[PDB]
Design a protein around this nucleic acid. Structure first.
Lengths: 84, 101, 100, 118, 87, 101, 97, 115
DNA sequence: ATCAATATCCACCTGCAGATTCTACCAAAAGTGTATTTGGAAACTGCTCCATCAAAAGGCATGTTCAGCTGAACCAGCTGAACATGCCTTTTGATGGCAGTTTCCAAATACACTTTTGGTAGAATCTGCAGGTGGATATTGAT
DNA sequence: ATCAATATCCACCTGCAGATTCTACCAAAAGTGTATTTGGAAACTGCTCCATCAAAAGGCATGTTCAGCTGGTTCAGCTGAACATGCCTTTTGATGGAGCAGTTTCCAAATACACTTTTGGTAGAATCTGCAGGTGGATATTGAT
């Protein structure tokens, strides 16, 4: 198991641009990208935090799609299409 | 021709908007997202595994969240008689939704 | 215990396909979409049953009847959707009670 | 003694396709109430059928406009967001592989040929 | 004509200065003249939805009197939970 | 008539802010609110009655909703380099919170 | 059977207040807010525990489901202290049978 | 035959002030699960007690700050909104007669060159 | 408003990745017959609310005055969008212990009953604090 | 800066409506003993995650130019904040009375329990077919002049 470090930078500038394009944004300041990365990291942390908690209750070491769906549900971001 | 052809700024962006709003494929790369997820999860629990569908679910949720925020951000930018989104637009949108940052 | 162990898993898929064939005979549906509709149905189920339970408990009633379902529908669903859903439910209960 | 008349089902009696019996079992199993009346699952099944028909109807219309004979998640998202009431009910739901509705703010469009006035 | 006088043009009882005061609690220093009518409409939309749900609870109980608990529950479903009036 | 005192625009507004943010009393008159409530309820069901505490609860909820919205509105106004809130600010705040209609 | 029979958490809130700040009273309105608060957190924890048990096909609520619900529902530093208090209470209860 | 050792409440055994029997009754009555374990209500009662003590502590501190000996709703709202974790947990809750926190946006105040 | 390049949409065309269709199996629904619980009809209680009205009251409405805001216009220069290279970094395809059954016996907990006694409604008691005077201090504006 | 004009905070006193205590009592907590459920070890087991490598292949980090957007500056028009009177709707405090929430009893009606019989719904293996991608033209876009 290799330690993972400095990986938020793999979410490149053009991918963030593409997402902004889907949002209808025409022009983007250069400082937006790092801010966006931080926002995403916080969201992800909270979801993973809850998903692993469900995992730990069941004494399982594999995070399922349903664990994520429930974590998202309690954060008000219900996701359809990955089960139940 | 003597000078290569070049579209003015504000045309290719619109073409990209129409293209990505017409399609549904995921716009973030699978591999760096999966690595980031594993990195964040590592600080909470060791030797974790992940189902592939868990990463695809997280990616769909993340991109939908960012898209919604960029829509609101763009309306905040336009409100200030600007066409360029800035960090202050994101901070305002997140403050109005009640999110802690 | 059989030689080849295999589980069971229920879904609303077959009923959605019957309804689809009723509304659009010349149309199919992908597996992902069917999964989305199953998720949708499950969500509305949980919402209505949970709300009906809460209403019954506040009024110290131990039975969930068609009245609590109707009320739950009016609270969760908006306007004309609520009126048409209520009409279908009433029609169904009236046909059931007679068609013993 | 026994006659054992041939089996009929509650969905057939109510004139519905959705399963009354299963909904009844799901209500009993799930801690909703101690006891469950006979009419509740019929009404609920009917409501679920109406909502399913409405969604499938609109998605099928969007599918025909795109000249596709099979419904994909995109057509359901388009159907939901173009219907005011479904959008209200599903205001906080994400449809996987659904995308978003096309919508560009007028201000983002080019000036016009009035800028190219010649 | 027994009782229940018909209620008409009562939204005007939410006067300009009361709205100004609420805006002041919100930290607003200067207010355009067109804000007031919009604000009145916004409030009506909120209230209608709340009363719609509250009366529904009333009808289920076969009651003719709206209690505080009915309102609290109606507000809960709109994500604006109110504390202090029981439950 | 001689040398009359007059405060500049903004000083009294700030004094009113300080005063009302220090206190907790309800700012809307009870009776007109009662009449509004009865009118709205009458359009759904006739001859309804109301407990006094139900009306007080609605008053608390309504005022909390308006104060929160005016705070968000003020941030939108400031974002546009203005100090005066306008209808477009409310519509934006309502759109981002999801109170669309 | 006269006049009626109600119930509240009033007496227990006053004891905690007297243990933490001996020289302090409480208004009736404030006590009502705390009772509403307690009922709300009760419903939230029990409801989440119910959902967890249903997802794991378990018919019993144990101290594990409450603990997990607390970690999901409460934020950061608040959850660790609450969990520590609950754990100490459970160990003292099982010891003092 | 029967001796009937005297009763002792579960709260005292757990070292708590909040009850246990009532919480157990409320879990049974409310369709949460078919059965409820003995430890669940102790843990829950302890959690409710800690959070109550936290609110009452901060509210009494605000009371002394205003030189008042009695806690009113205003002090509870001030306590919650000035505490990041309580504000997050109770972000969508309205405390009646609570008012709001004092807060004026810096750019709306007059410029400080006045003398 | 004609001209070069451009992207994007429109008609055939194929095999293939699902999507539909069809046999066997079985958990799960439905059908009888009893027991056990109920929510609705009727009656009686008394108590919370409603209509309306006589008298302050402090709140609101109109009507004046004006400092200061908004919105529009204009310009320096900085910003980020198009676009050409060539390279990392990603994509696909091979290759080599933990989630899900089955059993168990035993920790834990339902169910009925009796016993104790803690909590709660209400009469008495107490007491912190709104309210009201009054003095001394902090903000404010014109000058 | 200097100084009259208004607000704000504190010190003090006093009656009192709301908060705290003492009775009384009764429905619910708690201990005791049967009987019941299912949770954690312990042993399969099969299947699907994890590294690892190798051959592509294309998207993006770098670097370049240049249209045009932002933000600073000025300033004229108007326009809401502030304040002086006079209406006048809200507040209080009764007075009458009226009808409806709450509780109790009894009931035919309705649902669970327990067993047996029977069949629609799932799982897997066989056919159907709609369309991602590719090929070839035709025409709306954009821009330069």
């Amino acid at each position: 198991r290799k330690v993972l470090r400095d990986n938020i930078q793999g979410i490149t500038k053009p991918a963030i641009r593409r997402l902004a394009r889907r949002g209808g944004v025409k022009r983007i300041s250069g400082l937006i990208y790092e801010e966006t990365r931080g926002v995403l990291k916080v969201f992800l942390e909270n979801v993973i935090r809850d998903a692993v908690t469900y995992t730990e209750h069941a004494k399982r070491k594999t995070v399922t799609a349903m664990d994520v769906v429930y974590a998202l549900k309690r954060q008000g971001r219900t996701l359809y299409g990955f089960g139940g | 021709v003597k000078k290569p052809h070049r579209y003015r700024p504000g045309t290719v962006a619109l073409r990209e908007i129409r293209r990505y709003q017409k399609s549904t494929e995921l716009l973030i790369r699978k591999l760096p997202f999966q690595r980031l997820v594993r990195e964040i999860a590592q600080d909470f629990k060791t030797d974790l595994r992940f189902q592939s569908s868990a990463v695809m679910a997280l990616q769909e949720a993340c991109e939908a969240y960012l898209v919604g925020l960029f829509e609101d951000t763009n309306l905040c930018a336009i409100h200030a008689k600007r066409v360029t989104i800035m960090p202050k637009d994101i901070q305002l949108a997140r403050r109005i939704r009640g999110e802690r940052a | 215990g059989k030689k080849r162990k295999r589980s069971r898993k229920e879904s609303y898929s077959i009923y959605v396909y019957k309804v689809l064939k009723q509304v659009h005979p010349d149309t199919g549906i992908s597996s992902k979409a069917m999964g989305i509709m199953n998720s949708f149905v499950n969500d509305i189920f949980e919402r209505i049953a949970g709300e009906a339970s809460r209403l019954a408990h506040y009024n110290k009633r131990s039975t969930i009847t068609s009245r609590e379902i109707q009320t739950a529908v009016r609270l969760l669903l908006p306007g004309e959707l609520a009126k048409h859903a209520v009409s279908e439910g009433t029609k169904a209960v009236t046909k059931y009670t007679s068609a013993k | 003694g026994k006659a054992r008349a041939k089996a009929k089902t509650r969905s057939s009696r109510a004139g519905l396709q959705f399963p009354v019996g299963r909904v009844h079992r799901l209500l009993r199993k799930g801690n909703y109430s101690e006891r469950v009346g006979a009419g509740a699952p019929v009404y609920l099944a009917a409501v679920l059928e109406y909502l399913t028909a409405e969604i499938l109807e609109l998605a099928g219309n969007a599918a025909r406009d795109n000249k596709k004979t099979r419904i994909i998640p995109r057509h359901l998202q388009l159907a939901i967001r173009n219907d005011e009431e479904l959008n209200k009910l599903l205001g906080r739901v994400t449809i996987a592989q659904g995308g978003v509705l096309p919508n560009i703010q007028a201000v983002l469009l080019p000036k016009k040929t009035e800028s190219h006035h010649k």
